[PDB]
Design a protein around this nucleic acid. Structure first.
Lengths: 175, 187, 168, 75, 159
RNA sequence: ACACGCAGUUUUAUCCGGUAAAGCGAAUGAUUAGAGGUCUUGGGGCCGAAACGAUCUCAACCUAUUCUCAAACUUUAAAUGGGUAAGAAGCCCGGCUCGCUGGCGUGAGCCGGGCGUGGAAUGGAGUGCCUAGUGGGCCACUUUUGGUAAGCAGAACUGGCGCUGCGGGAUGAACCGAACGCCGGGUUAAGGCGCCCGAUGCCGACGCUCAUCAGACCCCAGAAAAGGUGUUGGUUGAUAUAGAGCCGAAUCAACUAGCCCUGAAAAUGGAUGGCGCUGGAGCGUCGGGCCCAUACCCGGCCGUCGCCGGCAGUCGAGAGUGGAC
RNA sequence: AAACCUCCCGUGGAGCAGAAGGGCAAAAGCUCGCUUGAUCUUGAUUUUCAGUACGAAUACAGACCGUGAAAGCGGGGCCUCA
RNA sequence: GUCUACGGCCAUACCACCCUGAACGCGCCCGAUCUCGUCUGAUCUCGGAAGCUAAGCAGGGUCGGGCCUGGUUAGUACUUGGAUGGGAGACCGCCUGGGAAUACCGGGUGCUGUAGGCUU
């Protein structure tokens, strides 16, 4: 499984009706995937892992993207992860600060890849929950909980280095 | 980058006769024009048979032609043979016929003309019936040659009746171990 | 909820070459009239067709074509098989002569029969020469992996329209 | 100086180069391998089939007349 | 190299199943076979006379000769270059009737019935079989109860 | 304007298997440990002249259990796979023949008549002879035999080199892509975009990493067990204003996963390909843009194959009439 | 503890010549009574197959038979090698 | 409802114990002259009908053993195809399809063909 700018999808599906079971129950899942095809594939994977249901033996009643209810609001998202390392699998709980649930999930994927070299196919996401200022255990996200936030940009390393390459003036890093 | 097997892309069917004689080539031109113009398939079949080699157009016997013309329905029809018509000595009553062939033996020609029949060449047949109407197409026995007796399942094999290549048939040239039950085995 | 019907036809494009191909995969590819790389063909969907596409899944990318995709494929790169010869559909006379017995007399009838799978979809598709599509402009994600795992092979039902736009 | 013993690596490709075919099925197969008593009975039946040919011809004529009467009644 | 024995490698093939040894049931003896009947061959360890070779086990062929208590059957055998239709004599106990042809015969009878019918009516009926079509788009009713959420189960070492 | 048959294919029904797996509280063989058994006998022993009288013990066995197994075990048992049938060579009638078989009847063979697209997709098929060269192979995914291992020897399916050029892996048999007539334009695959060397000369995104042996891309050209408060995350467990004399707010411990370090020693001077690179030109997850092979599209030319190809000199483009009287 | 007799349980854990596998319980094992189908002669088919032999084997057919009341079985050894 | 004779599928039919069988029938049972065969009329054969459900047999029961069929085990073990996926390896993860078997927990404990009897 690859990853990009992930989006959240609500997928409801059920096994195809049978003469013994005329009205099978429906199951709903939240899958974070780049597109609906991979979202449905991951939904079928998780459904096969959990219940006795297969893609050929079932059907997805409805797959639809879920939009963030408060895009302009900054939120703390706690994500429960179950990934596979070189050794045995482990369970983790991480906290991120972002405006969207899909963005938080993407940031979690990038952080997992950067810190543990864990691939998206080995990463399984269980639950993502929005939490208030309290109930936060990670100091990296706790330090930003401050009303009178104040910090400068000390070492402003300049960009546009290949804009005119030879110049008389040396650049400046204090602003 | 396409997977096409060129093993049998070239068809091996003949296009022109290998013979360098001029009369056959003129007949080939005539029947090429007739086949490519007329809608009748008789001209196409005649052209294909003209293209065939000597062994592929065996001579037709007078008795075989007589028995094929005696069939009910083909009364007063011209017989078309691309090979040669050969006289048969074991037939006495020869009714008059209308025979079209490349060649006719002298004896068969005399028999047909004495019986009151008519012999036509291929150009005359084209002039008479360009599309081959009222024609009975006949040919000699293709497997009549003794060559085909040596073909098929090889000898020394069960349920095989193929004539082997022997320098001279005799008592002490074959019918020994491999053919006699008293000597080894037989097939 | 309203579950949409499974599509009656699908568009399949071979994405890899002819070097190092399993015998069964090659047989299915040549049965689907997919011999050269970047060749497309409309295949109606059923149990047998889906099983064959599953067999040759790593070697093909297939999806559910759109009406505009069908129109562009038939118009820009539409060739008919007449007398075993690939002849462009420059006029409706060729289609009328070939498929007149089936109520198909023009490009519009051909497109309708291709899109809304009818009784003579087999005859229309067999008359249609396989579409020799060009290389995908803008590149590919990955030829050797499945579409779900970031590659281009496999089922890409809706994105096959984007692929057709980039190739046709 | 040992050599390779046995292998069938390219054998399948060699077989399928010419496209191995099923045996040619032809109607009216041979009667070889049938019990001699049954063969004798069938030979006798075929030999004596000529007996009672007129009865079969008369029955066929009667059937043709019946079919003609039936079609005349239908029309 | 391996031996060319006739019964080599038939430890499990020519062996009766569990709790099915003993006297052979008489239905196999008292069921008839005609010429041209499709029959699948399955060897039996109990009866040794007329036992077919291991290569013909599971193969299906048509009957061409019927003796007193044995059947002559032509089967297609592939030997390294080609498929040959060869005739073998197999005793009754090592032979079964094939229902694959019976399934087709029943469909033929149904087709004959459905062609005799619906002909005076004028309505042409579909006789050809069809592969599995699309699933005939329909509505799914979530009557009151919402779909059940499925959370992945966290890992735990059990063993 | 008008199709029969055939297939390293699939589907629909029907059979075949005893391999993976699993079991031995089910058969056979191996095998650990406790409970109830003078079952049954026997050895050492102790209380006994002895006693199945009390006490355990070691020997083979049992009664319900329990730990671990089997290529030459199996009650079960897949995935893959192997035969078939998907109609004209088929069905429904009527009548004859039989020295075979039978109470009448069978069963087979003969003749006459009525009923046609028999699942999906693709292919034009069938047949007969002359017949060179070859009969030293090798490599690769997967399964697997001997061997500690082998660029070792020997097998099964498939694909390659052999017989093969081309783009990439610096270099190159077998790797990735892709297969070859001579060219112009465009776009790609596998791969890459600091210079060599075409292209990131993006105001790329998020984090990790200091190495006085850093690291830098399938085959592949190199490292293990054990450790580190170096650093970055996760899991669990306690105690802390009832204060972990004084200072004064967070603190301690056990595991675990990333980068780096010790472990880590060979001989001509030496190789991420070299320079070099540390706000990477290193590592993990990823965005656009770009670079191009004989690969794909369009076009020009050469040759080969096919057109039931056309032209002996004629009307005519879904052709579905012409012409007297 | 093992000599002979009796009762009960007894899926075959015995035996069927051999090496092993398969197979068999009013048998294919043991004991009886009769016998030499371990006889003669055309073909067809199966196993290595090149679908050639040899060896082995399977259904038949034409005669003489053996046995049983009979149905039937038997032209060597229950089958896979000799 | 059920029995006998000949059977088909061969445990849902088998094994152990207990209870009940009205009528026909199946048997126990009474004897060895005849037919027959043994050390013994024990078996078999023959000639019978004084007693009996004691036994066989049939029907029912056992929180019965076994057997048949289901859930669980379990979308687990395994497995077709794919990748320039991870790992030094051993091995593992993912995509695409198929999909087991113990232990454990539920249900059942013969259907049926032909001919002939009883409850008329």
């Amino acid at each position: 499984k690859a990853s990009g700018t992930l989006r959240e999808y609500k997928v409801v599906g059920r096994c195809l009706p049978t003469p013994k079971c005329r009205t099978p129950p429906l199951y709903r899942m939240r899958i974070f995937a780049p597109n609906h095809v991979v979202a449905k594939s991951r939904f079928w994977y998780f459904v096969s892992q959990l219940k006795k249901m297969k893609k050929s033996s079932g059907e997805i009643v409805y797959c639809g993207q879920v939009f963030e209810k408060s895009p302009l609001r900054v939120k703390n998202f706690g994500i429960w992860l179950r990934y596979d390392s070189r050794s045995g699998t482990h369970n983790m709980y991480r906290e991120y600060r972002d405006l969207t649930t899909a963005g938080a999930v993407t940031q979690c994927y990038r952080d997992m890849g950067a810190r543990h070299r864990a691939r998206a196919h080995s990463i399984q996401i269980m639950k993502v929950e929005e939490i208030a200022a309290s109930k936060c255990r990670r100091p990296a996200v706790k330090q930003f909980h401050d009303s009178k936030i104040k910090f400068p940009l000390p070492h402003r390393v300049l960009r546009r280095q290949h804009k005119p390459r030879f110049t008389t003036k040396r650049p400046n890093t204090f602003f | 980058g396409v997977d096409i097997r060129h093993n049998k892309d070239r068809k091996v069917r003949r296009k022109e006769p290998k013979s360098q004689d001029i009369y056959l080539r003129l007949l080939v031109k005539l029947y090429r024009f007739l086949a490519r113009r007329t809608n009748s398939t008789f001209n196409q079949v005649v052209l294909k048979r003209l293209f065939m080699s000597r062994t592929n157009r065996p001579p037709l016997s007078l008795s075989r032609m007589i028995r094929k013309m005696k069939l009910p329905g083909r009364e007063g029809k011209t017989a078309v043979v691309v090979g040669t018509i050969t006289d048969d000595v074991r037939v006495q009553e020869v009714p008059k016929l209308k025979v079209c062939a490349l060649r006719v033996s002298s004896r068969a020609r005399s028999r047909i003309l004495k019986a009151g029949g008519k012999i036509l060449t291929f150009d005359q047949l084209a002039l008479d019936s360009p599309k081959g109407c009222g024609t009975v197409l006949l040919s000699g026995p293709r497997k009549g040659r003794e060559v085909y007796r040596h073909f098929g399942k090889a000898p020394g094999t069960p349920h095989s009746h193929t004539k082997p290549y022997v320098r001279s048939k005799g008592r002490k040239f074959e019918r020994a171990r491999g053919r006699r039950a008293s000597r080894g085995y037989k097939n | 909820f309203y579950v949409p019907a499974e599509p009656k036809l699908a568009f399949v494009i071979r994405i890899r070459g002819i070097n190092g191909v399993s015998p069964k995969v090659r047989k299915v590819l040549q049965l689907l009239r997919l011999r050269q790389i970047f060749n497309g063909t409309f295949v109606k969907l059923n149990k047998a067709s889906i099983n064959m596409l599953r067999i040759v899944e790593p070697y093909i990318a297939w999806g559910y074509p759109n009406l505009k995709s069908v129109n562009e494929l038939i118009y820009k790169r539409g060739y008919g098989k007449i007398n075993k010869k690939r002849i462009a559909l420059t006029d409706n006379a060729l289609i009328a002569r070939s498929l007149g017995k089936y109520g198909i007399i023009c490009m519009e009838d051909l497109i309708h029969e291709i899109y809304t799978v009818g009784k003579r979809f087999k005859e229309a598709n067999n008359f249609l020469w396989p579409f020799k599509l060009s290389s995908p402009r803008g590149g590919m994600k990955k030829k050797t992996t499945h579409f779900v795992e970031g590659e281009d092979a496999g089922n890409r039902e809706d994105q096959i329209n984007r692929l057709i736009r980039r190739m046709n | 100086a040992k050599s390779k013993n046995h292998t069938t690596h390219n054998q399948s490709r060699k077989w399928h180069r010419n496209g191995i075919k099923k045996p040619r099925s032809q109607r009216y197969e041979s009667l070889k391998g049938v019990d001699p008593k049954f063969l004798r009975n069938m030979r006798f039946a075929k030999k004596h089939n000529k007996k009672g040919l007129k009865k079969m011809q008369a029955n066929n004529a009667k059937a043709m007349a019946a079919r003609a009467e039936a079609i005349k009644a239908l029309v | 190299t391996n031996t060319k024995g006739k019964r080599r490698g038939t430890r499990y093939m020519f062996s009766r199943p569990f709790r099915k040894h003993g006297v052979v049931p008489l239905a196999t003896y008292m069921r008839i076979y005609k010429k041209g009947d499709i029959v699948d061959i399955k060897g039996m360890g109990t009866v040794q006379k007329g036992m077919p070779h291991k290569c013909y086990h599971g193969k299906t062929g048509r009957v061409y000769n019927v003796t007193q208590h044995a059947v002559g059957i032509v089967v297609n055998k592939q030997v390294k270059g080609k498929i040959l239709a060869k005739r073998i004599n197999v005793r009754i106990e090592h032979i079964k009737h094939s229902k694959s042809r019976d399934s087709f015969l029943k469909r033929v009878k149904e087709n004959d019935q459905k062609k005799k019918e619906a002909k005076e009516k004028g309505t042409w009926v579909q006789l050809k079989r069809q592969p599995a079509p699309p699933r005939e788009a329909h509505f799914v009713r979530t009557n009151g109860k919402e779909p059940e959420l499925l959370e992945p189960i966290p890992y735990e070492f059990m063993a």
